[PDB]
Every structure is written in structure tokens, then in C-alpha cells.
RNA sequence: GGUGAAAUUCUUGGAUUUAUUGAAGACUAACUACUGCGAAAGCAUUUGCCAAGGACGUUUUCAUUAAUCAAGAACGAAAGUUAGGGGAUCGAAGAUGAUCAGAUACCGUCGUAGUCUUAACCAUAAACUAUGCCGACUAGGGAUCGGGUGGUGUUUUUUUAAUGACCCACUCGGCACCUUACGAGAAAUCAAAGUCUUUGGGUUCUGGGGGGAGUAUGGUCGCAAGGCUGAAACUUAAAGGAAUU
């Protein structure tokens, strides 16, 4: 169910005799048998887990923690990463470039793996057959196939009904609309071709 | 026993700027400009407007006993005109006549290495 | 409207021992109230002064230094090297057509963990008894001259920390041995040095930076 | 004999699915079916397994990368900028 | 006798004639 | 350049290709200088360096792969390490 | 048809094109070889220099000029009154 | 903020500007010249690597292996097309504010595709020196790029050994200039556009009045846009070139 691969890295317990098997998001350019340096005093290399508070500006970092102790919030999809714009020594925070092009400020004590997640450009080849889509969505949930609400029944959907086919009312749905009416465009500030 | 400053005259087109400030540059005084003493939309770069702006700047300069101030004249820079505005000479002459000590002139207009292609396109402006 | 002048104070800055002159002007600074603490905001500041002002002569007119403040102490804040630049009004003077321009760059380190971006400029001279018109370069002497000038400046900076690098930069003896060691390539007039840019810094390093004003 | 002149790899799809779809999946199939070499041996033995998997039968090294290309231009530029930053901090 | 614009009009006529031809075949 | 000296050696002096020929050559003592590619496994070139410094043999590092090493030495296949027993008409032992 | 060489371009290479400076008639110059009109006009115009010399805190020093290498006069400087239309005595210089 | 004048737009949430920087993309300004390379298009930071190319010198080699090109292959500006990366400035479309009787044009501000790169197409331009390639001769002069030769040449030190910077005289290969026209051209002009009625050195391609028309159709390549080949019917006595008042 994930286009990006999984990196299984075995760690060493510094407290007792044991070796911890960790599941990491597999970046690109990292190969099995290469040493992962997880910490703050490490060097800027692909696969390292240097916190954003100990790295300069402009570095590319994937799997960025939203808050310390969350252990993986941001940049978990294949071909995506996070760009750092700046940081402030007072009230330690890091400016990050979110994969959606959004702006978010998080603490400097958030760990992230340096590099880009492997499997980039996954959505470049169309799925062709319905079988590829069926196999793709079988491993995720029961969300396929999706039926149009305009070919529906009046009781089955607000968009259905009528001898002809038509949406009927405005497709845009207010944010404050109650559950059930949220069918179509939700809080659409603007529509049409971008 | 004299105190200096930076006036950083910004002689542009259709507007004139004078900004007397300390050498540090993080604290400034007398934000008066060419358009402060006129309402015409076309006489901002006129010598009279620049003279009035410098006179106001010089008057407000000696609030707590400021003696001298350095200047660094610059144009709009970038890739637009690369030449100082007509009001720059009138701006720097008005306060000098007003008793303000002037020195260490320095042409701080920015010049690029043929980058950031300017406004107009291939055939540019046509009149 | 409140009065900013009554809400702000005056400060005095002293140049390092690299320059014999000490006072380099007067900076207007807001009062360091407990809510804002403007005293620590002065750390990230620079002051630009002319070498002629800092030396008392007139041959340093086309030279100036920006001087970054490091530590503040009772209206007597001291400063430290940030980087010098050749004034652009003068920098457009020695460059003319019908001659060859020479530009070399390095990323050489020093003895005090500083990193500098040193550049240099060299020309071709219309020699005495010349009848020619342009005296252009062969284009391969620049290839032969770029390596030696970079080598000679890198060996000079290496083994000498920042203090004597500045104390010998102000006299401008750097271009003194360029010409004589390269008299076999070109006449090589106007070998005035170019910008030095300081990129990465070590920590605050209390005490040693006081010696420049001790 | 070169039975197909332009269709190439995507001849199983036949006449349907249109032209753009078949040609796009064809361009992708040439590079994702290509034989690569492991950066540690140099022999052309790397083959694709699962998505993002670049396995080998001789070097026995799996290098994670693009789902269809072992190293894209994005990989090159990110490696370049990361090594630039590493040099700058370590300088 | 503007060569460029009459030339562009000629290509528009080419477009229309090609459409007419493709209507039948 | 490295390639011209390597070709001059391959035309005049004797040579052993591969791993085990190289290891027997050095271990017996005839080898004077070994050539290791950049893509050689660390452990491999580390042991080679250990054998060389225990046998007092010079070491040179080559930036490149095995295929380009083979093309430089003059053999179309790939070679991970080579050694030179005598230069012959070459002088790579003296310089570098 | 006049203008045998038009400009000084006899070799090949096409050079490049730079933007025209404050003309309102900017366009793609036929290569960098145009009318130049380099200017060394002073930062301070004639007269009123006596006030500047007196007002200087330190004595002597100063008096530099603006060093502007111009490429703005190209095929439109007749409007700006820079390049003069001439006749068959154009053989002077180039 | 801008224009000849205005206006849209941004401004107590601080516009614009300044000082400390940091990030992204693009270019290689000043040096830049009747100065240089590449077959052409084209090339204008530093350094390393790889191969290739012109000229120079040769008392070294082959031996006429040679010049031009139907059919035929490779490069090929900008723009355009496919799929990624990137997407800072400018910016086909478009959204606005003018001036205008009218203005979806010139003028100001935003602004998608595009402008940069990758793999694969597109095979076009005022792609012009509007002047094909090879070879020989013909009035002179000066400057310049690369190389070479000779003159105790003037310089550079450790005056002097050398190198390199230049001087003088010359040579070859050039890009090219200045005065004149033996000669050509209808003239503009040409050191070739001369050596063509005193007609013939070798070779390839193109045109027989202007429109129709680079159009119809037929083939051919191309994802498409488009490229190559390429008419006829019908109409007119004028179209066109150089200089004069």
C-alpha cells in the first residue's frame, strides 16, 4: 500500500544487551550495509537523523517530526521532502517548506532524515486497466469504485434524482454545513480552471 | 568633537529620498522625503521639492545636537535606469547650504552582471 | 507622537589595534529596557569606515573597511574584522578598454579557523617606448599568472593568523612582491587587492577579542 | 526482424487504450526494464523488483531509489546541494 | 500586401480545407 | 597521465591481473606498486594496503571503476586491482 | 541602399543582447556594437562646489565622478539628440 | 509606485528605504575592440579531466590516394510538442487602469504556457557577406590575430646568464580596412561583383513577366504543430531594380 520503500535499520541498545530493529522510511541514495548516524553531533549525509536545530539553512530533509517525541509526522510520501528557510536562536524554532507549498514553524528539537524518500515520481505512469487500480486500492481500503452522485437516487444522495441528470443546486458546500450536506465542493473559495 | 551619520540619498525618478541615520544603519531619523512638501504627482523629483526635503531633514537633524552626517548617493539601481535622478543634486546642495557638514560621498547605486532581465520585453517601450 | 531621541542613547565605538586610530564614530542606540533588552541587539551590527579616516593619510581614500561590533561594554563597544571592499566610484576608474583584466579567487583557510574570500586584480601596462595601440594579453599568460598569484597569496595567509594579516594589509605590501616575482610575465601595474569576504565564524571567544582593544 | 515499427514494448495492449497512454507507458518501460550496474561492482546486473526496489543477483546490493529510474535528476541536484552544505559546515 | 498576415490567413484556410476533407474521409 | 604510463608498462614490463595473482605476487615480494580502483570494496583495499605496508610496497589510489581501469590498462574486461613487478622501460616507480 | 556594413560586424558569433538603459525606446540592439556614448559626468555638477569644500569636515580629499558605461543610444538617439544624421561625408572614422 | 500627463496597486496589521543576513532561479556585466575560435547554428567567470581542430617549422613518410556533388546521412537560431526537475526576473493568452468617437493596440500593475536543464521529436529564419565550392594571375599602403626568422635591439632581475614584455625588417595563414579604377557593372559599387562578343579552368544547384501560388492533387517524414516535391484553370500589360529634378 506504500509506493515508498521501508528501511529496516537495526540499532544497538546502549543500556542493555539487545539490538533494536527499527522501521525507517527508505530514502533514495541509501543502500544496505551503510552506517546510519542517528543523532545531533553527526555529519550532513543522506540517511542521517540530524535534528533541524543543528543543520544550516537550505538542507533537504525528509520525515520531519512535527513536535519532539512524535516520531514521524511530515514528509512520509515517496518523492517528497522538506526545505529549511531559516531559524531563530531565541525560542528555538525552524522554518520549514511543507510538501504542499505551505508555511509551518516547528521546534528545533525535531528529528528528520536527510535526503529524499525513494520512489520519486511514482505518479507518472497511468494505471491503464481497471485491474491496476483495483489491485492498488485493495491494499488500502474499500474506496473503489466511486459512483457519481448525479446518477444517484433522490434518497441515496442530494445530487441524484430527476428524469434527466443534473446537480440541481450549487455544488459548493459551506464549511459550517451540517453532516450529510457535505457532498461536492467543501468551502470552495473559487472554482473552475486554475 | 563632532558626531557623524549617514544620509544615504536615494535619487530616483518621479521621487526623491533622503534618510539621515547612524553609521550602524539599524536606527534612522527624519524619514522626510521629496513628496512630503508637495502634492503634485509630477514635481516630486523637481529641485524645489528636493530642496524642501533636505531643509526639513537638516532642521530635524539637530534635535539633540547632531553636527555632521555622511552621504552616499544612489540611483534606483537594478536594471531600470542606472542613472541618478535630477533631484539628487538639489537634495545634496540644500542641506549643505543650511550649515550641515557634508563629506565622504560615495556612489552606492547597485549594478548587476547582466542579470534579472528588465521590464519591456524584446521590443520594449514604444511611444 | 513620542520623542524617539529621549527614548534612545548614544554609544562610542573603538577600532581594533590593527588600526592605530580607535574612535570610528558614534552610534545611536535605544535604551536597554528590561522588556526589550536592546543591549544584546547590538551584537549583530556592522560599521563602515574609510581607511583614509582610519589612517590619517590620503593614499587610503580609495580603501574602506566595514567593522563588525563584537562586544559592548559601557558605551565603549569594540569591534572586529568583517570584510573590506573597494569603493565602486573608484573601482570603475582603473578599468579601461584596450587592456586585459585579471581576476583570481581562492578559498584558503587561516591559522584562527577563519575562512576568507580573497580576490585580486592585475593589469597590462603600456610600456615605455611603446608604439602599439592596445598591448593585449596573449590569453595564456593569464593562465600562467593565475596559478602563481593564488599560490603566493595562499602561502602568505597560511601560517599567519588574522592579526598580522590586517596589520600587513593596511600598508598594502601584498602587491609589492607580486610585480617583482612576476616581472617575467607582464609589466603588471595596478595590483591593488580586492574584496575579502568572511563566511564562517567560530564561537564568541571571549578574552582574545579583547586584546585588539587591550 | 523488428516486427513492430513504433509500438515497441507496448504491443501487448493492442489497438485500444489510445496512443498517448501506450506511448507514455512505453517510454517508462524502456527505462524501468533497463539493465543497470551496482555502484560497487560495475557489472550490468541490477534489476527492478518492487516499487522503489533496485535489486541485484551478483553484487547482492539493493539501492533504494526512483520507482522506475535508479537515479533521477532530482537525486543528482539533492546530492549536490547536500554535499555543498556538508562542505560548508565542515569547512 | 502584408506577407506574414496573409500567410497566416492562408494557413487558416488550410485548416478549414483540411477539416472539410476530413469530414468525408 | 596515468593511462600512458600504464600502457607503457603493459607493453614492456610483466604484470598480473586480478586478485589472487596480485596477492601471491606481492606476498612473494616481486611487486613494487599496486593499483586499486575507487569502487573496490573497502575491506578489500584496506587489506591490500595492510599487505603492502607489511611488505613495504607503495600504494596509489585510482579514482574510477574497474571497467575504466581495464580500458586504461588495455584489456576490454574489468580489473579490480593490478600490480607491476618491474617497470621495464617505464619510470612510474621513480616519480609519483 | 547605403550602410554597406551597417555596423562593425564582419566576423560571426552574434554576441549577445543587453537591455537598453532609460530610453523608453529599448529594444534588441543589433549585437553589442552600437553607439556607446560612455559618460564620466561628475557626481556633483559645476558650481556649488565651493560650499561642499568649505562644509567638508576634513580638508582636501573627495571630488570623484560618476563612471557610467552607456549603451543606451541605439537607433533612437535622434529623439534624445545624441547621434546626428549625416550624409556621404560619413567616411570619417568608421 | 510609475507615465508627457494619470490611474490600478501597496500603506498604524509600518508601505518604500536602510543595516545583519539566509534561500531560489537566471547570466557571466565592467575587461568588450572594423581584436579572436567553430562546417553552420553558434562561443564572452575559476579550476581539473577527456578527446578533437586551424596556423607555424620540418633537408621525415606515402604516392596522385585529387576538386565538385544526383540519390543519399550528421549538425542545425528562436519558437513549438511529449514526460520529469526547477519555476527567481521577463513573459505569447488573459485580468485591470488609462488616452481615444471607437482601442481586447502602443502606455502602467499582476499574471498561465514559456524563458533553464534532462531523454526523445520538430529540420524551419533577412539560417545575409542576399555574393557556392576548388585552383591561378592582376595598382599600392597601413594597422591587427597566431607562428617563425635576423638585427650585442630597448627592457626584467641575481646591471649581465635566460624567459617574457615590447622595437625594427620580413614571411605564411587569415578575419578584414584605406586612395584609385587598368576591368566589370544599369547604377548603387566591386581587389572582385576583374581576367565575359577579344565570349570556353573544373563542378553542383536555381529562374524565364506579375498574380493565381508555394495553391490543388498525388507521394514522403513527423505525436501534433508542420517539413520536402509540387501544378492547372483564369486574369493583366504592366509588376520590379539603380539614380535625377
PDB file of N, CA and C (backbone and C1' of nucleotides) in Angstrom, chain H residues 153-185:
ATOM      1  P     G H 153      70.623  42.480 -30.458  1.00  0.00           P
ATOM      2  O5'   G H 153      70.948  43.958 -30.964  1.00  0.00           O
ATOM      3  C5'   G H 153      71.159  45.023 -30.046  1.00  0.00           C
ATOM      4  C4'   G H 153      70.050  46.042 -30.106  1.00  0.00           C
ATOM      5  C3'   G H 153      69.408  46.385 -28.771  1.00  0.00           C
ATOM      6  O3'   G H 153      70.132  47.384 -28.074  1.00  0.00           O
ATOM      7  C1'   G H 153      67.724  45.945 -30.383  1.00  0.00           C
ATOM      8  P     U H 154      70.209  47.367 -26.471  1.00  0.00           P
ATOM      9  O5'   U H 154      68.846  48.052 -26.015  1.00  0.00           O
ATOM     10  C5'   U H 154      68.524  49.379 -26.407  1.00  0.00           C
ATOM     11  C4'   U H 154      67.156  49.771 -25.909  1.00  0.00           C
ATOM     12  C3'   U H 154      66.874  49.426 -24.454  1.00  0.00           C
ATOM     13  O3'   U H 154      67.365  50.415 -23.565  1.00  0.00           O
ATOM     14  C1'   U H 154      65.078  48.682 -25.808  1.00  0.00           C
ATOM     15  P     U H 155      67.213  50.235 -21.976  1.00  0.00           P
ATOM     16  O5'   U H 155      66.977  48.673 -21.788  1.00  0.00           O
ATOM     17  C5'   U H 155      66.590  48.145 -20.530  1.00  0.00           C
ATOM     18  C4'   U H 155      65.099  47.933 -20.455  1.00  0.00           C
ATOM     19  C3'   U H 155      64.619  47.103 -19.274  1.00  0.00           C
ATOM     20  O3'   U H 155      64.467  47.873 -18.096  1.00  0.00           O
ATOM     21  C1'   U H 155      63.634  46.282 -21.259  1.00  0.00           C
ATOM     22  P     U H 156      64.932  47.286 -16.676  1.00  0.00           P
ATOM     23  O5'   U H 156      64.244  45.850 -16.605  1.00  0.00           O
ATOM     24  C5'   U H 156      62.918  45.689 -16.122  1.00  0.00           C
ATOM     25  C4'   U H 156      62.691  44.284 -15.623  1.00  0.00           C
ATOM     26  C3'   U H 156      63.781  43.728 -14.717  1.00  0.00           C
ATOM     27  O3'   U H 156      63.604  44.111 -13.362  1.00  0.00           O
ATOM     28  C1'   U H 156      63.231  42.136 -16.395  1.00  0.00           C
ATOM     29  P     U H 157      64.521  45.260 -12.711  1.00  0.00           P
ATOM     30  O5'   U H 157      66.006  44.794 -13.045  1.00  0.00           O
ATOM     31  C5'   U H 157      66.862  44.292 -12.029  1.00  0.00           C
ATOM     32  C4'   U H 157      66.406  42.942 -11.532  1.00  0.00           C
ATOM     33  C3'   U H 157      67.420  42.159 -10.715  1.00  0.00           C
ATOM     34  O3'   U H 157      67.460  42.568  -9.357  1.00  0.00           O
ATOM     35  C1'   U H 157      66.438  40.743 -12.339  1.00  0.00           C
ATOM     36  P     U H 158      68.693  43.434  -8.795  1.00  0.00           P
ATOM     37  O5'   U H 158      69.908  42.405  -8.763  1.00  0.00           O
ATOM     38  C5'   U H 158      69.786  41.151  -8.111  1.00  0.00           C
ATOM     39  C4'   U H 158      70.849  40.188  -8.573  1.00  0.00           C
ATOM     40  C3'   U H 158      71.002  40.046 -10.080  1.00  0.00           C
ATOM     41  O3'   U H 158      71.782  41.081 -10.656  1.00  0.00           O
ATOM     42  C1'   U H 158      70.909  37.901  -9.097  1.00  0.00           C
ATOM     43  P     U H 159      72.273  40.973 -12.183  1.00  0.00           P
ATOM     44  O5'   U H 159      72.361  42.484 -12.680  1.00  0.00           O
ATOM     45  C5'   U H 159      71.206  43.311 -12.733  1.00  0.00           C
ATOM     46  C4'   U H 159      71.441  44.532 -13.589  1.00  0.00           C
ATOM     47  C3'   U H 159      71.479  44.298 -15.092  1.00  0.00           C
ATOM     48  O3'   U H 159      70.191  44.224 -15.680  1.00  0.00           O
ATOM     49  C1'   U H 159      73.328  45.622 -14.460  1.00  0.00           C
ATOM     50  P     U H 160      69.994  43.479 -17.091  1.00  0.00           P
ATOM     51  O5'   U H 160      70.925  42.193 -16.971  1.00  0.00           O
ATOM     52  C5'   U H 160      71.241  41.401 -18.106  1.00  0.00           C
ATOM     53  C4'   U H 160      72.729  41.374 -18.348  1.00  0.00           C
ATOM     54  C3'   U H 160      73.297  40.079 -18.908  1.00  0.00           C
ATOM     55  O3'   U H 160      73.108  39.937 -20.310  1.00  0.00           O
ATOM     56  C1'   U H 160      74.615  40.780 -17.085  1.00  0.00           C
ATOM     57  P     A H 161      73.400  38.539 -21.064  1.00  0.00           P
ATOM     58  O5'   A H 161      72.165  37.589 -20.700  1.00  0.00           O
ATOM     59  C5'   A H 161      71.974  37.052 -19.394  1.00  0.00           C
ATOM     60  C4'   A H 161      72.905  35.900 -19.109  1.00  0.00           C
ATOM     61  C3'   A H 161      72.581  34.583 -19.793  1.00  0.00           C
ATOM     62  O3'   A H 161      73.015  34.542 -21.141  1.00  0.00           O
ATOM     63  C1'   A H 161      73.066  34.191 -17.512  1.00  0.00           C
ATOM     64  P     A H 162      71.944  34.399 -22.331  1.00  0.00           P
ATOM     65  O5'   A H 162      70.589  34.948 -21.697  1.00  0.00           O
ATOM     66  C5'   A H 162      69.338  34.723 -22.331  1.00  0.00           C
ATOM     67  C4'   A H 162      68.624  33.540 -21.724  1.00  0.00           C
ATOM     68  C3'   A H 162      67.119  33.471 -21.943  1.00  0.00           C
ATOM     69  O3'   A H 162      66.777  32.928 -23.207  1.00  0.00           O
ATOM     70  C1'   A H 162      67.636  33.006 -19.671  1.00  0.00           C
ATOM     71  P     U H 163      65.290  33.086 -23.801  1.00  0.00           P
ATOM     72  O5'   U H 163      64.386  32.170 -22.858  1.00  0.00           O
ATOM     73  C5'   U H 163      63.004  31.985 -23.123  1.00  0.00           C
ATOM     74  C4'   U H 163      62.166  32.250 -21.896  1.00  0.00           C
ATOM     75  C3'   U H 163      61.107  33.332 -22.043  1.00  0.00           C
ATOM     76  O3'   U H 163      59.901  32.814 -22.581  1.00  0.00           O
ATOM     77  C1'   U H 163      62.318  33.625 -20.007  1.00  0.00           C
ATOM     78  P     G H 164      59.373  33.270 -24.028  1.00  0.00           P
ATOM     79  O5'   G H 164      58.356  34.452 -23.706  1.00  0.00           O
ATOM     80  C5'   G H 164      57.338  34.291 -22.729  1.00  0.00           C
ATOM     81  C4'   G H 164      57.210  35.522 -21.869  1.00  0.00           C
ATOM     82  C3'   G H 164      57.016  36.830 -22.620  1.00  0.00           C
ATOM     83  O3'   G H 164      55.666  37.056 -22.989  1.00  0.00           O
ATOM     84  C1'   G H 164      58.739  37.093 -21.028  1.00  0.00           C
ATOM     85  P     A H 165      55.318  37.782 -24.379  1.00  0.00           P
ATOM     86  O5'   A H 165      55.442  39.332 -24.040  1.00  0.00           O
ATOM     87  C5'   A H 165      54.659  39.918 -23.010  1.00  0.00           C
ATOM     88  C4'   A H 165      55.103  41.329 -22.715  1.00  0.00           C
ATOM     89  C3'   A H 165      55.317  42.221 -23.926  1.00  0.00           C
ATOM     90  O3'   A H 165      54.105  42.790 -24.388  1.00  0.00           O
ATOM     91  C1'   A H 165      57.137  42.450 -22.418  1.00  0.00           C
ATOM     92  P     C H 166      53.531  42.426 -25.843  1.00  0.00           P
ATOM     93  O5'   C H 166      53.610  43.805 -26.634  1.00  0.00           O
ATOM     94  C5'   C H 166      54.604  44.021 -27.622  1.00  0.00           C
ATOM     95  C4'   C H 166      55.571  45.104 -27.214  1.00  0.00           C
ATOM     96  C3'   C H 166      56.459  45.637 -28.326  1.00  0.00           C
ATOM     97  O3'   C H 166      55.813  46.616 -29.118  1.00  0.00           O
ATOM     98  C1'   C H 166      57.787  45.138 -26.441  1.00  0.00           C
ATOM     99  P     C H 167      56.041  46.641 -30.706  1.00  0.00           P
ATOM    100  O5'   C H 167      57.540  47.155 -30.863  1.00  0.00           O
ATOM    101  C5'   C H 167      57.934  48.423 -30.362  1.00  0.00           C
ATOM    102  C4'   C H 167      59.231  48.870 -30.984  1.00  0.00           C
ATOM    103  C3'   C H 167      59.386  48.546 -32.461  1.00  0.00           C
ATOM    104  O3'   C H 167      58.749  49.495 -33.298  1.00  0.00           O
ATOM    105  C1'   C H 167      61.340  47.894 -31.304  1.00  0.00           C
ATOM    106  P     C H 168      58.107  49.035 -34.696  1.00  0.00           P
ATOM    107  O5'   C H 168      59.370  48.818 -35.641  1.00  0.00           O
ATOM    108  C5'   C H 168      60.320  49.855 -35.838  1.00  0.00           C
ATOM    109  C4'   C H 168      61.576  49.334 -36.486  1.00  0.00           C
ATOM    110  C3'   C H 168      61.370  48.448 -37.701  1.00  0.00           C
ATOM    111  O3'   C H 168      61.108  49.189 -38.878  1.00  0.00           O
ATOM    112  C1'   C H 168      62.961  47.454 -36.261  1.00  0.00           C
ATOM    113  P     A H 169      59.893  48.765 -39.837  1.00  0.00           P
ATOM    114  O5'   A H 169      60.510  47.596 -40.723  1.00  0.00           O
ATOM    115  C5'   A H 169      61.716  47.798 -41.444  1.00  0.00           C
ATOM    116  C4'   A H 169      62.220  46.508 -42.033  1.00  0.00           C
ATOM    117  C3'   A H 169      61.153  45.525 -42.480  1.00  0.00           C
ATOM    118  O3'   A H 169      60.585  45.848 -43.735  1.00  0.00           O
ATOM    119  C1'   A H 169      62.791  44.381 -41.234  1.00  0.00           C
ATOM    120  P     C H 170      59.053  45.471 -44.039  1.00  0.00           P
ATOM    121  O5'   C H 170      59.094  43.900 -44.303  1.00  0.00           O
ATOM    122  C5'   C H 170      59.950  43.363 -45.299  1.00  0.00           C
ATOM    123  C4'   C H 170      60.164  41.880 -45.124  1.00  0.00           C
ATOM    124  C3'   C H 170      58.924  41.008 -45.156  1.00  0.00           C
ATOM    125  O3'   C H 170      58.432  40.793 -46.467  1.00  0.00           O
ATOM    126  C1'   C H 170      60.345  40.305 -43.402  1.00  0.00           C
ATOM    127  P     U H 171      56.882  40.438 -46.694  1.00  0.00           P
ATOM    128  O5'   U H 171      56.800  38.878 -46.389  1.00  0.00           O
ATOM    129  C5'   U H 171      57.665  37.963 -47.042  1.00  0.00           C
ATOM    130  C4'   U H 171      57.609  36.601 -46.402  1.00  0.00           C
ATOM    131  C3'   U H 171      56.221  36.003 -46.249  1.00  0.00           C
ATOM    132  O3'   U H 171      55.738  35.424 -47.448  1.00  0.00           O
ATOM    133  C1'   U H 171      57.417  35.746 -44.227  1.00  0.00           C
ATOM    134  P     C H 172      54.230  35.704 -47.923  1.00  0.00           P
ATOM    135  O5'   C H 172      53.414  34.471 -47.335  1.00  0.00           O
ATOM    136  C5'   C H 172      53.880  33.142 -47.515  1.00  0.00           C
ATOM    137  C4'   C H 172      53.258  32.203 -46.514  1.00  0.00           C
ATOM    138  C3'   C H 172      51.765  32.374 -46.290  1.00  0.00           C
ATOM    139  O3'   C H 172      50.981  31.758 -47.293  1.00  0.00           O
ATOM    140  C1'   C H 172      52.857  32.227 -44.202  1.00  0.00           C
ATOM    141  P     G H 173      49.642  32.474 -47.818  1.00  0.00           P
ATOM    142  O5'   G H 173      48.548  32.061 -46.738  1.00  0.00           O
ATOM    143  C5'   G H 173      48.353  30.698 -46.393  1.00  0.00           C
ATOM    144  C4'   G H 173      47.629  30.557 -45.079  1.00  0.00           C
ATOM    145  C3'   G H 173      46.403  31.433 -44.896  1.00  0.00           C
ATOM    146  O3'   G H 173      45.254  30.923 -45.553  1.00  0.00           O
ATOM    147  C1'   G H 173      47.736  31.535 -42.952  1.00  0.00           C
ATOM    148  P     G H 174      44.673  31.666 -46.854  1.00  0.00           P
ATOM    149  O5'   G H 174      43.504  32.584 -46.286  1.00  0.00           O
ATOM    150  C5'   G H 174      43.797  33.755 -45.539  1.00  0.00           C
ATOM    151  C4'   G H 174      43.092  33.752 -44.208  1.00  0.00           C
ATOM    152  C3'   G H 174      42.132  34.907 -43.970  1.00  0.00           C
ATOM    153  O3'   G H 174      40.859  34.673 -44.546  1.00  0.00           O
ATOM    154  C1'   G H 174      43.542  34.648 -42.087  1.00  0.00           C
ATOM    155  P     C H 175      40.048  35.870 -45.241  1.00  0.00           P
ATOM    156  O5'   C H 175      39.211  36.505 -44.045  1.00  0.00           O
ATOM    157  C5'   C H 175      38.416  35.690 -43.197  1.00  0.00           C
ATOM    158  C4'   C H 175      38.045  36.422 -41.934  1.00  0.00           C
ATOM    159  C3'   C H 175      37.536  37.842 -42.125  1.00  0.00           C
ATOM    160  O3'   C H 175      36.161  37.897 -42.468  1.00  0.00           O
ATOM    161  C1'   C H 175      39.180  37.816 -40.427  1.00  0.00           C
ATOM    162  P     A H 176      35.702  38.274 -43.963  1.00  0.00           P
ATOM    163  O5'   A H 176      35.810  39.863 -44.019  1.00  0.00           O
ATOM    164  C5'   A H 176      37.024  40.502 -44.382  1.00  0.00           C
ATOM    165  C4'   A H 176      37.437  41.524 -43.353  1.00  0.00           C
ATOM    166  C3'   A H 176      37.547  42.959 -43.846  1.00  0.00           C
ATOM    167  O3'   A H 176      36.292  43.616 -43.890  1.00  0.00           O
ATOM    168  C1'   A H 176      39.459  42.409 -42.564  1.00  0.00           C
ATOM    169  P     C H 177      36.073  44.884 -44.850  1.00  0.00           P
ATOM    170  O5'   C H 177      36.886  46.053 -44.137  1.00  0.00           O
ATOM    171  C5'   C H 177      37.064  47.307 -44.779  1.00  0.00           C
ATOM    172  C4'   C H 177      38.096  48.153 -44.079  1.00  0.00           C
ATOM    173  C3'   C H 177      38.647  49.316 -44.890  1.00  0.00           C
ATOM    174  O3'   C H 177      37.808  50.456 -44.831  1.00  0.00           O
ATOM    175  C1'   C H 177      40.435  48.124 -43.886  1.00  0.00           C
ATOM    176  P     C H 178      37.343  51.199 -46.177  1.00  0.00           P
ATOM    177  O5'   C H 178      38.497  52.264 -46.445  1.00  0.00           O
ATOM    178  C5'   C H 178      38.847  53.228 -45.461  1.00  0.00           C
ATOM    179  C4'   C H 178      40.199  53.828 -45.750  1.00  0.00           C
ATOM    180  C3'   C H 178      40.416  54.286 -47.184  1.00  0.00           C
ATOM    181  O3'   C H 178      39.888  55.577 -47.435  1.00  0.00           O
ATOM    182  C1'   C H 178      42.243  52.957 -46.507  1.00  0.00           C
ATOM    183  P     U H 179      39.003  55.845 -48.749  1.00  0.00           P
ATOM    184  O5'   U H 179      40.078  56.198 -49.869  1.00  0.00           O
ATOM    185  C5'   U H 179      40.865  57.376 -49.778  1.00  0.00           C
ATOM    186  C4'   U H 179      41.831  57.480 -50.931  1.00  0.00           C
ATOM    187  C3'   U H 179      41.263  57.141 -52.300  1.00  0.00           C
ATOM    188  O3'   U H 179      40.567  58.230 -52.883  1.00  0.00           O
ATOM    189  C1'   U H 179      43.334  56.034 -52.003  1.00  0.00           C
ATOM    190  P     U H 180      39.769  58.045 -54.264  1.00  0.00           P
ATOM    191  O5'   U H 180      40.913  58.052 -55.374  1.00  0.00           O
ATOM    192  C5'   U H 180      40.585  58.096 -56.752  1.00  0.00           C
ATOM    193  C4'   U H 180      41.379  57.090 -57.548  1.00  0.00           C
ATOM    194  C3'   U H 180      40.560  56.148 -58.411  1.00  0.00           C
ATOM    195  O3'   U H 180      40.181  56.747 -59.636  1.00  0.00           O
ATOM    196  C1'   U H 180      42.221  54.925 -57.236  1.00  0.00           C
ATOM    197  P     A H 181      38.699  56.548 -60.221  1.00  0.00           P
ATOM    198  O5'   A H 181      38.917  55.558 -61.446  1.00  0.00           O
ATOM    199  C5'   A H 181      40.182  55.484 -62.098  1.00  0.00           C
ATOM    200  C4'   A H 181      40.546  54.063 -62.451  1.00  0.00           C
ATOM    201  C3'   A H 181      39.528  53.335 -63.326  1.00  0.00           C
ATOM    202  O3'   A H 181      40.210  52.444 -64.204  1.00  0.00           O
ATOM    203  C1'   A H 181      39.793  52.172 -61.284  1.00  0.00           C
ATOM    204  P     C H 182      40.560  52.901 -65.703  1.00  0.00           P
ATOM    205  O5'   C H 182      42.020  52.313 -65.942  1.00  0.00           O
ATOM    206  C5'   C H 182      42.505  52.054 -67.250  1.00  0.00           C
ATOM    207  C4'   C H 182      43.215  50.726 -67.306  1.00  0.00           C
ATOM    208  C3'   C H 182      42.327  49.506 -67.497  1.00  0.00           C
ATOM    209  O3'   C H 182      42.010  49.280 -68.860  1.00  0.00           O
ATOM    210  C1'   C H 182      43.899  49.108 -65.753  1.00  0.00           C
ATOM    211  P     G H 183      40.504  49.461 -69.389  1.00  0.00           P
ATOM    212  O5'   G H 183      39.698  48.307 -68.646  1.00  0.00           O
ATOM    213  C5'   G H 183      40.018  46.943 -68.873  1.00  0.00           C
ATOM    214  C4'   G H 183      39.187  46.024 -68.015  1.00  0.00           C
ATOM    215  C3'   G H 183      37.697  46.316 -67.965  1.00  0.00           C
ATOM    216  O3'   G H 183      37.002  45.839 -69.104  1.00  0.00           O
ATOM    217  C1'   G H 183      38.499  45.894 -65.781  1.00  0.00           C
ATOM    218  P     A H 184      35.609  46.511 -69.539  1.00  0.00           P
ATOM    219  O5'   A H 184      34.550  45.886 -68.526  1.00  0.00           O
ATOM    220  C5'   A H 184      34.390  44.480 -68.420  1.00  0.00           C
ATOM    221  C4'   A H 184      33.619  44.098 -67.181  1.00  0.00           C
ATOM    222  C3'   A H 184      32.264  44.760 -67.013  1.00  0.00           C
ATOM    223  O3'   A H 184      31.257  44.145 -67.794  1.00  0.00           O
ATOM    224  C1'   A H 184      33.444  44.837 -64.964  1.00  0.00           C
ATOM    225  P     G H 185      30.155  45.041 -68.540  1.00  0.00           P
ATOM    226  O5'   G H 185      29.129  45.413 -67.381  1.00  0.00           O
ATOM    227  C5'   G H 185      28.568  44.401 -66.560  1.00  0.00           C
ATOM    228  C4'   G H 185      27.929  44.986 -65.327  1.00  0.00           C
ATOM    229  C3'   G H 185      27.124  46.255 -65.538  1.00  0.00           C
ATOM    230  O3'   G H 185      25.837  46.022 -66.081  1.00  0.00           O
ATOM    231  C1'   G H 185      28.533  46.542 -63.679  1.00  0.00           C
TER     232        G H 185
END
